[PDB]
Amino acid sequence: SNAARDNVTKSKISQYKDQIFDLTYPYSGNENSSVIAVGFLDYSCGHCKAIKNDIKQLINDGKIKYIFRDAPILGNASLKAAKSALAVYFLDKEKYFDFHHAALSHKGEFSDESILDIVKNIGIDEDDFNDSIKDNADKIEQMINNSRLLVRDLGVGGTPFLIIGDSLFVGATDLNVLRKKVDELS
């Protein structure tokens, strides 16, 4: 696009800053970094799957806080995988990225079983996992609804997209562009 439209994006990010940088959502990287990235993903989306290592590398660079917004819009399978991801988060936050990355690595469509195969491979017990789904159902539901509305409010109209600082990157953004913006802001 161009300057005028980027300026509007900056104003919207300020308007929704409490929502975008909400602290109750899962994050990796430096908790205390002022350079905060906020990623919006559907696990069944082809472009979301393909940037999984861009995300991993950008996080491992060490410079940012990266918040994960699970924004399922591609159907029942995505909602399941999204719900399951947060069900892991609330059991053990250190395992959320592992579910995240495995879900993105999961090439075919999700099924109840394949999601459990993932919960098993990352060290979580089926019964702890089932109790998490049920016990935290209201809060998971609330978090996903709030992310969907945020995606609507930002008007992007699909996934993936990534907010860093006052900028919004749409689609499979090259890693070098993200890194330059992060450095500029550091």
Numbering used by the authors: 63 to 248
Sentences reproduced from the published study:
The introduction, isomerization and reduction of protein disulfide bonds in bacteria are controlled by disulfide-bond-forming (DSB) proteins. wMel strain encodes two DsbA-like proteins, α-DsbA1 and α-DsbA2, and the integral membrane protein α-DsbB. In contrast, α-DsbA2, which is highly conserved in Wolbachia, does not interact with α-DsbB and has a long N-terminal region compared with α-DsbA1.
We used two constructs: (i) FL α-DsbA2, the full-length mature α-DsbA2 (lacking the signal peptide that directs the protein to the periplasm) comprising residues 16–252, and (ii) α-DsbA2ΔN, a truncated form of α-DsbA2 (lacking both the signal sequence and the 50-residue N-terminal region) comprising residues 65–252. We were unable to generate crystals of full-length mature α-DsbA2. The crystal structure of truncated α-DsbA2ΔN reveals a classic monomeric DsbA-like architecture. Using SAXS data, the molecular mass of truncated α-DsbA2ΔN was estimated to be ∼23 kDa from I(0) and the Porod volume, which is very close to the expected mass for an α-DsbA2ΔN monomer (21 kDa) and is consistent with the crystal structure that we report here. We next assessed the protein disulfide isomerase activity of FL α-DsbA2 and α-DsbA2ΔN by following the reactivation of scrambled RNase A in an in vitro assay. By comparison, truncated α-DsbA2ΔN recovered just 35 ± 3% of the RNase A activity relative to native refolded RNase A over this period, similar to that reported for the oxidase enzyme EcDsbA.
